[PDB]
Amino acid sequence: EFLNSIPWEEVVPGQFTANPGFQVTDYFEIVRQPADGNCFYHSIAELFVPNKNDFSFRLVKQHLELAARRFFEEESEAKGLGLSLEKYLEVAMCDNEWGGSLEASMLAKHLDITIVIWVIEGPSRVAAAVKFGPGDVAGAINLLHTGYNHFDALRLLV
Amino acid sequence: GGDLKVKMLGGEEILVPLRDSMMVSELKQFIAQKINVPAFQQRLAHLDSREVLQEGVPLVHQGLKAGSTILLMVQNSSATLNILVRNDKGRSSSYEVQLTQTVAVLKQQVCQRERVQADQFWLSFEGKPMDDEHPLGEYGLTTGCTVFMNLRLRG
């Protein structure tokens, strides 16, 4: 497939980057998520939880509360923040809080999965791609980073 | 072991203990703590072969023993160099910097060249993140090395 045929450069252990230039809708199915501040966890729960609901996102953040005590003090992105685990979890677990590459990496290392973030610039052209995990892209939890402040789910097509 | 001889600027000799089968990093660190110059600002070389002193190899099969000297070069003019820094899109621009200055300077430079905020990205080189407060030369930089810029991707 064209998705298993991708060049991935390694940034840090557990993080790859690439820059494929194409359109999302050609292969993926964009499931839009609400803009309540938890769109990242919503788009995760869309692909990871059976019979997803608008509040099935909370469960996912539960998993983060484990990985935070597992990799935050050892995560390559957390260095240089000047915040301890408690200062982190006090706001990151607070309702209506944004989520990005740090949470994706910690959840991929925690859940033994592979999170792929497809960031698009312009209306529908992919600018870059960041992949936390070693797994297949077809079997990965594919996210879409519309704009620079939203997340939607990307169902894989048959 | 004995005492190895380092020849600095071809006009002075410094003696150093010869711990048999020891690395060049500890040699540079010894000279660093002895003359108060950073380790990344030192370049050690052979006498007459003009060959590169390999790193990560014990200078043993390399052919070194006490009574033999090695030439040492210091580099703070302050000199400059330039690296390639890759955006998250892939368009790696060229940034000329110096190993003496901090990584915060390079971060603000990447900010002004990408028009993006500072809190929204971090630099990496060879599978390890770069700390802001630490100097640049501590990461083993060279001309043409591709330092990655990784966004926080917070959304």
Residue numbers in the entry:
A (entry chain A): 2 to 159
B (entry chain B): 2 to 156
Task: Paste lines from the article.
Beyond the RNA-dependent RNA polymerase (RdRp), the L protein contains a viral homologue of the ovarian tumor domain protease (OTU) at the N-terminus. This OTU reverses posttranslational modifications by ubiquitin (Ub) and interferon (IFN) stimulated gene product 15 (ISG15). Sheep ISG15 was derivatized into a suicide inhibitor with propargylamine and incubated with KUPEV and GANV OTUs to form covalent complexes that could be used for X-ray crystallography. This yielded an atomic resolution structure of KUPEV OTU bound to the C-terminal domain of sheep ISG15 (C-sheep ISG15) solved to 2.06 Å and a low-resolution structure of GANV OTU bound to full length sheep ISG15 to 3.15 Å.
